[PDB]
Design a protein around this motif. Structure first.
Motif, PDB file in Angstrom:
ATOM      1  N   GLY A  10       0.826  -1.233   0.000  1.00 43.73           N
ATOM      2  CA  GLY A  10       0.000   0.000   0.000  1.00 43.73           C
ATOM      3  C   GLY A  10       0.847   1.263   0.000  1.00 43.73           C
ATOM      4  O   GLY A  10       2.066   1.216   0.169  1.00 43.73           O
ATOM      5  N   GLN A  11       0.183   2.399  -0.220  1.00 45.66           N
ATOM      6  CA  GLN A  11       0.824   3.703  -0.070  1.00 45.66           C
ATOM      7  C   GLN A  11       0.167   4.550   1.034  1.00 45.66           C
ATOM      8  O   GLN A  11      -1.086   4.563   1.153  1.00 45.66           O
ATOM      9  CB  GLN A  11       0.665   4.465  -1.367  1.00 45.66           C
ATOM     10  CG  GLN A  11       1.477   3.914  -2.552  1.00 45.66           C
ATOM     11  CD  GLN A  11       1.328   4.825  -3.772  1.00 45.66           C
ATOM     12  OE1 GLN A  11       2.255   5.566  -4.102  1.00 45.66           O
ATOM     13  NE2 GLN A  11       0.198   4.785  -4.409  1.00 45.66           N
ATOM     14  N   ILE A  19      -5.986   5.016  -8.953  1.00 43.67           N
ATOM     15  CA  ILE A  19      -6.884   4.004  -9.467  1.00 43.67           C
ATOM     16  C   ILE A  19      -6.523   2.579  -8.982  1.00 43.67           C
ATOM     17  O   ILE A  19      -5.322   2.214  -8.852  1.00 43.67           O
ATOM     18  CB  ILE A  19      -6.919   4.072 -11.052  1.00 43.67           C
ATOM     19  CG1 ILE A  19      -8.102   3.251 -11.576  1.00 43.67           C
ATOM     20  CG2 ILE A  19      -5.552   3.641 -11.661  1.00 43.67           C
ATOM     21  CD1 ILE A  19      -8.225   3.199 -13.101  1.00 43.67           C
ATOM     22  N   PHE A  20      -7.579   1.799  -8.689  1.00 43.38           N
ATOM     23  CA  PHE A  20      -7.449   0.395  -8.267  1.00 43.38           C
ATOM     24  C   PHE A  20      -6.973   0.246  -6.821  1.00 43.38           C
ATOM     25  O   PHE A  20      -6.555  -0.839  -6.388  1.00 43.38           O
ATOM     26  CB  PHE A  20      -6.571  -0.421  -9.230  1.00 43.38           C
ATOM     27  CG  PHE A  20      -7.147  -0.479 -10.636  1.00 43.38           C
ATOM     28  CD1 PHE A  20      -6.431   0.009 -11.701  1.00 43.38           C
ATOM     29  CD2 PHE A  20      -8.416  -1.046 -10.867  1.00 43.38           C
ATOM     30  CE1 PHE A  20      -6.960  -0.029 -12.984  1.00 43.38           C
ATOM     31  CE2 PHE A  20      -8.947  -1.096 -12.144  1.00 43.38           C
ATOM     32  CZ  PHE A  20      -8.216  -0.545 -13.201  1.00 43.38           C
ATOM     33  N   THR A  21      -7.073   1.335  -6.083  1.00 42.55           N
ATOM     34  CA  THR A  21      -6.837   1.255  -4.625  1.00 42.55           C
ATOM     35  C   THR A  21      -7.936   1.963  -3.879  1.00 42.55           C
ATOM     36  O   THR A  21      -8.643   2.810  -4.429  1.00 42.55           O
ATOM     37  CB  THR A  21      -5.478   1.885  -4.232  1.00 42.55           C
ATOM     38  OG1 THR A  21      -5.540   3.302  -4.391  1.00 42.55           O
ATOM     39  CG2 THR A  21      -4.323   1.331  -5.118  1.00 42.55           C
ATOM     40  N   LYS A  22      -8.051   1.656  -2.604  1.00 41.22           N
ATOM     41  CA  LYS A  22      -9.001   2.408  -1.769  1.00 41.22           C
ATOM     42  C   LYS A  22      -8.436   2.511  -0.362  1.00 41.22           C
ATOM     43  O   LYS A  22      -7.468   1.819  -0.043  1.00 41.22           O
ATOM     44  CB  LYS A  22     -10.382   1.737  -1.751  1.00 41.22           C
ATOM     45  CG  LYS A  22     -10.380   0.223  -1.484  1.00 41.22           C
ATOM     46  CD  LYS A  22     -11.814  -0.320  -1.295  1.00 41.22           C
ATOM     47  CE  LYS A  22     -12.009  -1.717  -1.880  1.00 41.22           C
ATOM     48  NZ  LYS A  22     -11.049  -2.792  -1.454  1.00 41.22           N
ATOM     49  N   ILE A  23      -9.079   3.337   0.463  1.00 42.54           N
ATOM     50  CA  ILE A  23      -8.634   3.551   1.853  1.00 42.54           C
ATOM     51  C   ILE A  23      -8.793   2.248   2.667  1.00 42.54           C
ATOM     52  O   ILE A  23      -9.915   1.700   2.757  1.00 42.54           O
ATOM     53  CB  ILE A  23      -9.454   4.695   2.485  1.00 42.54           C
ATOM     54  CG1 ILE A  23      -9.231   6.003   1.697  1.00 42.54           C
ATOM     55  CG2 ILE A  23      -9.117   4.841   3.971  1.00 42.54           C
ATOM     56  CD1 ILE A  23     -10.188   7.160   2.109  1.00 42.54           C
ATOM     57  N   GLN A  24      -7.684   1.759   3.246  1.00 38.82           N
ATOM     58  CA  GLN A  24      -7.677   0.597   4.119  1.00 38.82           C
ATOM     59  C   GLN A  24      -6.694   0.861   5.296  1.00 38.82           C
ATOM     60  O   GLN A  24      -5.537   0.457   5.283  1.00 38.82           O
ATOM     61  CB  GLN A  24      -7.342  -0.669   3.305  1.00 38.82           C
ATOM     62  CG  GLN A  24      -8.198  -0.778   1.974  1.00 38.82           C
ATOM     63  CD  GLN A  24      -8.116  -2.136   1.250  1.00 38.82           C
ATOM     64  OE1 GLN A  24      -8.443  -2.245   0.043  1.00 38.82           O
ATOM     65  NE2 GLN A  24      -7.695  -3.168   1.975  1.00 38.82           N
ATOM     66  N   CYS A  35      -3.665   3.625   1.116  1.00 38.83           N
ATOM     67  CA  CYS A  35      -4.380   3.277  -0.105  1.00 38.83           C
ATOM     68  C   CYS A  35      -3.805   1.966  -0.597  1.00 38.83           C
ATOM     69  O   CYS A  35      -2.589   1.867  -0.839  1.00 38.83           O
ATOM     70  CB  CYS A  35      -4.217   4.337  -1.216  1.00 38.83           C
ATOM     71  SG  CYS A  35      -4.883   5.919  -0.706  1.00 38.83           S
ATOM     72  N   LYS A  36      -4.682   0.961  -0.699  1.00 40.30           N
ATOM     73  CA  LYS A  36      -4.260  -0.350  -1.240  1.00 40.30           C
ATOM     74  C   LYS A  36      -5.413  -1.033  -1.985  1.00 40.30           C
ATOM     75  O   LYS A  36      -5.151  -1.964  -2.742  1.00 40.30           O
ATOM     76  CB  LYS A  36      -3.693  -1.259  -0.164  1.00 40.30           C
ATOM     77  CG  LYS A  36      -4.626  -1.525   0.990  1.00 40.30           C
ATOM     78  CD  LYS A  36      -3.821  -1.663   2.275  1.00 40.30           C
ATOM     79  CE  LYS A  36      -4.598  -2.433   3.314  1.00 40.30           C
ATOM     80  NZ  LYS A  36      -4.509  -3.893   3.096  1.00 40.30           N
TER      81      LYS A  36
END
Length: 36
Positions: A10-11, A19-24, A35-36
């Motif tokens: 993740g970042q 794109i293709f990641t979300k808050i986790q 974001c992963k």
């Protein structure tokens, strides 16, 4: 946290995810998102 975020690929980002990641989870004393 940063450790869990980045060790999984993740970042830690203070604003919206790419794109293709979300808050986790969070990073940096809860002020950034993972974001992963």
């Amino acid at each position: 946290d940063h450790y869990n975020c980045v060790s999984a690929g993740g970042q830690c980002l203070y604003s919206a995810c790419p794109i293709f990641t979300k808050i986790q989870g969070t990073c940096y004393r809860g002020k950034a998102k993972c974001c992963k």
